[PDB]
Amino acid sequence: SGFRKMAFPSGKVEGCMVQVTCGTTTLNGLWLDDVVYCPRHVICTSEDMLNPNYEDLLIRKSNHNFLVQAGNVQLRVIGHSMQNCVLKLKVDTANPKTPKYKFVRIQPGQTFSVLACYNGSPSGVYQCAMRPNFTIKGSFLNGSCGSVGFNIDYDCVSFCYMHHMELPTGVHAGTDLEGNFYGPFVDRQTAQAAGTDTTITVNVLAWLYAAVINGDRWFLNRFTTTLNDFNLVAMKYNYEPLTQDHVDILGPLSAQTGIAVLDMCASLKELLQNGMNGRTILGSALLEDEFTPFDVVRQCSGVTFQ
Amino acid sequence: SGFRKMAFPSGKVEGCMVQVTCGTTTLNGLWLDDVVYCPRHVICTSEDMLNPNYEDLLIRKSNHNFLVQAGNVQLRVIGHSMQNCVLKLKVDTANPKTPKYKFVRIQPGQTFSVLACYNGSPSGVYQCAMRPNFTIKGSFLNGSCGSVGFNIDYDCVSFCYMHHMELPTGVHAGTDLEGNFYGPFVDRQTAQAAGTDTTITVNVLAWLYAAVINGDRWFLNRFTTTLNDFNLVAMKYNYEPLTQDHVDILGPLSAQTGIAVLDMCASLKELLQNGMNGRTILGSALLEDEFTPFDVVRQCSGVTFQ
Numbered sequence: 320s321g322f323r324k325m326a327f328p329s330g331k332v333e334g335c336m337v338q339v340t341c342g343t344t345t346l347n348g349l350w351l352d353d354v355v356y357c358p359r360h361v362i363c364t365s366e367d368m369l370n371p372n373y374e375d376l377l378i379r380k381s382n383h384n385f386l387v388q389a390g391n392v393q394l395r396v397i398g399h400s401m402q403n404c405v406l407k408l409k410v411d412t413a414n415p416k417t418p419k420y421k422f423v424r425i426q427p428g429q430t431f432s433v434l435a436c437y438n439g440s441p442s443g444v445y446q447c448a449m450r451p452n453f454t455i456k457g458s459f460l461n462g463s464c465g466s467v468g469f470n471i472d473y474d475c476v477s478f479c480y481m482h483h484m485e486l487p488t489g490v491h492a493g494t495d496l497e498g499n500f501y502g503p504f505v506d507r508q509t510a511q512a513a514g515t516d517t518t519i520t521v522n523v524l525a526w527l528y529a530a531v532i533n534g535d536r537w538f539l540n541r542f543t544t545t546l547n548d549f550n551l552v553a554m555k556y557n558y559e560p561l562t563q564d565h566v567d568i569l570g571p572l573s574a575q576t577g578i579a580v581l582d583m584c585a586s587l588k589e590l591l592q593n594g595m596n597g598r599t600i601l602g603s604a605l606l607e608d609e610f611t612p613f614d615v616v617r618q619c620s621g622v623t624f625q
Numbered sequence: 626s627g628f629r630k631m632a633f634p635s636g637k638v639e640g641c642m643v644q645v646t647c648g649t650t651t652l653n654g655l656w657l658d659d660v661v662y663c664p665r666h667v668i669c670t671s672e673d674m675l676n677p678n679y680e681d682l683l684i685r686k687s688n689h690n691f692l693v694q695a696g697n698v699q700l701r702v703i704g705h706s707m708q709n710c711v712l713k714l715k716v717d718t719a720n721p722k723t724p725k726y727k728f729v730r731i732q733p734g735q736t737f738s739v740l741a742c743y744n745g746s747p748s749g750v751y752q753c754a755m756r757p758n759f760t761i762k763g764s765f766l767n768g769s770c771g772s773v774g775f776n777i778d779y780d781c782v783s784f785c786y787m788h789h790m791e792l793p794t795g796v797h798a799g800t801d802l803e804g805n806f807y808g809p810f811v812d813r814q815t816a817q818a819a820g821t822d823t824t825i826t827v828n829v830l831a832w833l834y835a836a837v838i839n840g841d842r843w844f845l846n847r848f849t850t851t852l853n854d855f856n857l858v859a860m861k862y863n864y865e866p867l868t869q870d871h872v873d874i875l876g877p878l879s880a881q882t883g884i885a886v887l888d889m890c891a892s893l894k895e896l897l898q899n900g901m902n903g904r905t906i907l908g909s910a911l912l913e914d915e916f917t918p919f920d921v922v923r924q925c926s927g928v929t930f931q
């Protein structure tokens with residue numbers, strides 16, 4: 320038992336991190352087969368990044384401008400191209416540690432692991448979620464760009480995030496592995512509005528089920544409610560609406576506990592209107608929304624990978 | 626910026642995890658050089674587990690009773706021996722993936738990363754603390770025994786924890802790698818209870834510094850206090866005493882923010898007496914005590930490992 324913010328094992332990804340240097344800009348790259356992926360603003364200078372013209376900047380570049388470092392091995396660059404906001408550097412050596420992988424673009428609400436890196440080397444691994452305003456609440460310092468987010472399904476790494484920039488509210492923005500930003504953000508140092516964030520209601524319900532599975536079952540009550548009357552209190556409390564699809568995804572969790580989905584909604588309703596009265600759920604004094612229904616099931620049934 | 630529960634990258638440890646099977650019992654083992662380390666209750670039958678004398682089952686075992694899979698490859702066992710509560714199975718093959726390592730015994734308050742495993746396969750990685758009562762608040766299902774906890778300095782894995790058992794409050798107990806339990810627990814199904822937990826004061830203060838370093842600022846005040854005045858408040862609220870050694874360890878953080886340790890104590894003091902009143906610190910509604918001052922510095926300074 321017990322319930323923790325759990326990240327996927329990071330080995331398969333560590334073997335792909337390299338360091339990319341152009342001018343006096345160092346950041347991290349992702350080396351898969353004979354291609355190194357990194358954010359395109361590695362080619363900018365401190366004077367450039369007020370409003371650069373990226374394909375101007377890239378045409379002025381040669382392969383030899385890009386210093387690509389894998390441990391101590393230097394990696395020869397033999398071609399380059401720009402796909403939206405990521406740079407793709409063709410190198411003369413296929414990464415022998417290339418895992419089975421996919422590139423996927425994830426929806427808001429879904430979670431992934433982040434392997435924070437600096438100068439090609441991993442610093443740490445943590446879990447988080449793609450907020451409904453398409454930001455992530457990460458932990459990223461200077462030089463962390465190029466760090467990636469990922470899920471693991473048995474043997475195969477699905478990369479979903481590359482890190483690009485910090486917004487002034489302390490949150491983070493980046494792209495998928497095809498260079499397309501999540502949200503309305505751009506890799507230019509002009510004024511950008513993060514947008515107001517809502518709580519991921521389906522995830523909060525999932526964590527409430529994790530709480531029941533782990534013995535926390537105060538906050539449960541008599542009541543039931545309709546999706547309309549629940550959705551109508553979630554509106555007040557800045558929660559995103561609950562759909563029938565959400566109801567269905569929580570089915571397995573609902574069946575394993577004997578608490579129907581609309582009953583757990585009546586608990587959430589009552590928790591929102593009254594607060595927690597000095598109590599904690601799974602060691603938290605707030606309602607947590609960064610566990611999906613899948614995160615709950617895999618952690619409370621012990622699903623593994625290889 | 627930003628601040629999350631960050632675990633060490635788990636690559637070096639994944640390549641050491643194996644499966645150990647004896648009788649009907651399966652758990653995980655740690656394979657370094659030609660030795661596999663696992664909990665000794667793998668030799669128990671489901672009826673022995675009431676009060677086994679472990680030198681029993683061991684002298685009654687033969688080498689071929691131990692089935693050890695490293696992936697599909699079966700490792701032949703050519704010797705065995707017991708060191709306190711762990712078995713050491715000598716196998717005929719040195720692990721080619723053996724990282725540089727040490728075995729260390731941590732103190733309460735210190736944190737480490739856990740790579741939870743099932744049937745030799747890594748399932749997830751998270752961070753946590755050795756509680757003052759020598760429990761850890763983990764996430765462990767059946768088959769997780771033999772999973773290890775660890776730290777990393779530059780390039781060296783310091784294993785500090787092997788998992789053995791769950792206590793009835795939902796918390797977990799285990800050994801160091803040299804066989805000795807943390808706390809007064811034994812690997813028998815006899816009645817045992819954790820003992821009353823306290824809060825790691827020095828860690829709460831470190832986390833407050835992380836909050837300041839990240840712009841959470843609302844909890845500061847004019848006041849200062851003495852260590853003796855503060856420790857009388859810590860005692861009422863079930864907090865560990867603060868020593869002058871703790872004050873010194875908090876120096877770096879104190880110097881980076883310009884807030885004296887005894888100033889941060891005076892504002893922890895008022896947080897304890899007024900509570901938090903709505904608001905949060907680093908996304909939490911509780912005072913967090915599972916970050917050490919080393920954890921705060923490395924995450925805020927971006928220390929990496931190789």
Ligand SMILES: *[C@H](O)[C@H](C[C@@H]1CCNC1=O)NC(=O)[C@@H]1[C@@H]2[C@H](CN1C(=O)[C@@H](NC(=O)NC(C)(C)C)C(C)(C)C)C2(C)C
Pocket residue numbers: 346360368459460461462463464465483484485486487491505506507508509510511626
């Ligand atoms: C790449 O390693 C860094 C990682 C940053 C640095 C600290 N935290 C991070 O996530 N990214 C950047 O330096 C990007 C890069 C240039 C500016 N930038 C930022 O993150 C800046 N933020 C903004 O300028 N944000 C707005 C919304 C555009 C105003 C920052 C935080 C000032 C360095 C560019 C965006 C190309």
Ligand SMILES: *[C@H](O)[C@H](C[C@@H]1CCNC1=O)NC(=O)[C@@H]1[C@@H]2[C@H](CN1C(=O)[C@@H](NC(=O)NC(C)(C)C)C(C)(C)C)C2(C)C
Pocket residue numbers: 320652666669674765766767768769770771789790791792793797811812813814815816817818
């Ligand atoms: C080894 O894989 C498991 C891991 C446990 C099982 C679920 N979560 C865990 O942490 N460890 C055990 O099976 C140990 C082992 C036998 C019993 N045991 C337990 O953890 C049991 N707990 C207790 O017996 N606790 C008291 C306090 C001694 C009564 C449990 C959780 C009921 C299966 C032995 C201790 C040898």
